[PDB]
């Protein structure tokens, strides 16, 4: 869900 | 070279503006023009009556933004979002996997309460179902006293991926003005190194945005998004090593035909582009 964070 | 036996002389310039002006008129928006995106729902779309958004290039149906591509440079130019668009504005930056957002609107402008320019990136907030979060980082000078403040937005919406967005904010660039080529050049170089670092992170993580030509495009906007936005974009274009031989005529024409015939509003702004092109041996005219 926060894959690119 | 075309055939003016003096590429950046006066005659050459006179001719350049001759063709450009003819194009501005041809692109002049008409009432209910089929070429330009119209206002639907009764809501206000354009920030300015005369600064319209092209149809077959608009990012989304409810915003005044365009998918512009000069030569090999792919970016997105828009107007300063109205409060009634901020919710949509954010969803675009997220879906776009924005590697760099550049705001060329003066602090004074965002300040003046009459101008209706929401301070959506220097402070945190909630807009509809989106939950953004601003964070201050670096601060780089660009010469001539002009400075850029950087922030990192974080667009979070339930049921959607959380996107971090690097922001470069130049708050001393007056309205209807044009910073020297020095500043402009230094500015274009910072935006490129910003998007480049971010786009790398996306590739490293295997995002599928690296396979879509409509994503990962630097988003830039000033106030109307046709003057200061154009000068920076024209500089970014030239900052690319793949756009060799692309003339000034091509740069400007493509910008106008992909957004509106106002790109590079003032002449003091075109000149900054002419002087930069003059130091690279880049042609001003075509044929």
Swiss-Prot record, chain B:
Induction: At 37 degrees Celsius in the absence of calcium. It comes from the Bacteria. GO terms for cellular component: extracellular region. It catalyses: O-phospho-L-tyrosyl-[protein] + H2O = L-tyrosyl-[protein] + phosphate. Keywords: Hydrolase, Plasmid, Protein phosphatase, Secreted, Virulence. Its EC number is 3.1.3.48. It is an enzyme of class 3 (hydrolase). One of its GO terms (molecular function) is protein tyrosine phosphatase activity. It is found in: Secreted. Residues 1-280 form the Tyrosine-protein phosphatase domain. The active site is at 222 (phosphocysteine intermediate). Belongs to the protein-tyrosine phosphatase family. Non-receptor class subfamily. Monomer. Essential virulence determinant. This protein is a protein tyrosine phosphatase. The essential function of YopH in Yersinia pathogenesis is host-protein dephosphorylation. It contributes to the ability of the bacteria to resist phagocytosis by peritoneal macrophages. This is Tyrosine-protein phosphatase YopH. It comes from Yersinia enterocolitica.
């Amino acid at each position: 869900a926060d894959e690119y964070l | 070279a075309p055939s003016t036996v003096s590429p950046y002389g006066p005659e050459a310039r006179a001719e350049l503006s001759s063709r450009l002006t003819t194009l501005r008129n041809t692109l002049a928006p008409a009432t209910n023009d089929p070429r330009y995106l119209q206002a639907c729902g009764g809501e206000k779309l354009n920030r300015f009556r005369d600064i319209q958004c092209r149809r077959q290039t608009a990012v989304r149906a409810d915003l005044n933004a365009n998918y512009i591509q000069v030569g090999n440079t792919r970016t997105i130019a828009c107007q300063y979002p109205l409060q009634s668009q901020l919710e949509s504005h954010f969803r675009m930056l997220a879906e776009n996997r924005t590697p760099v957002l550049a705001v060329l609107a003066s602090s004074s402008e965002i300040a003046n309460q009459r101008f209706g320019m929401p301070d959506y990136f220097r402070q945190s907030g909630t807009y509809g179902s989106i939950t953004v979060e601003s964070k201050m980082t670096q601060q780089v000078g660009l010469g001539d006293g002009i400075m850029a403040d950087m922030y990192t937005l974080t667009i979070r919406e339930a049921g959607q991926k959380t996107i971090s967005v690097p922001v470069v904010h130049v708050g001393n660039w007056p309205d209807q003005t044009a910073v020297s080529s020095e500043v402009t050049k230094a500015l274009a170089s910072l935006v490129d190194q910003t998007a480049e670092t971010k786009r790398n992170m996306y590739e490293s993580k295997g995002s599928s945005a690296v396979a879509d030509d409509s994503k990962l495009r630097p988003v830039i906007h000033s106030r109307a998004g046709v003057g200061r936005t154009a000068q920076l974009i024209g500089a970014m274009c030239m900052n690319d090593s793949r756009n060799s031989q692309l003339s000034v005529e091509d740069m400007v024409s493509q910008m106008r035909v992909q957004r509106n015939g106002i790109m590079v509003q003032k002449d003091e702004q075109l000149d900054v582009l002419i002087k930069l092109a003059e130091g690279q041996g880049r042609p001003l005219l075509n044929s």
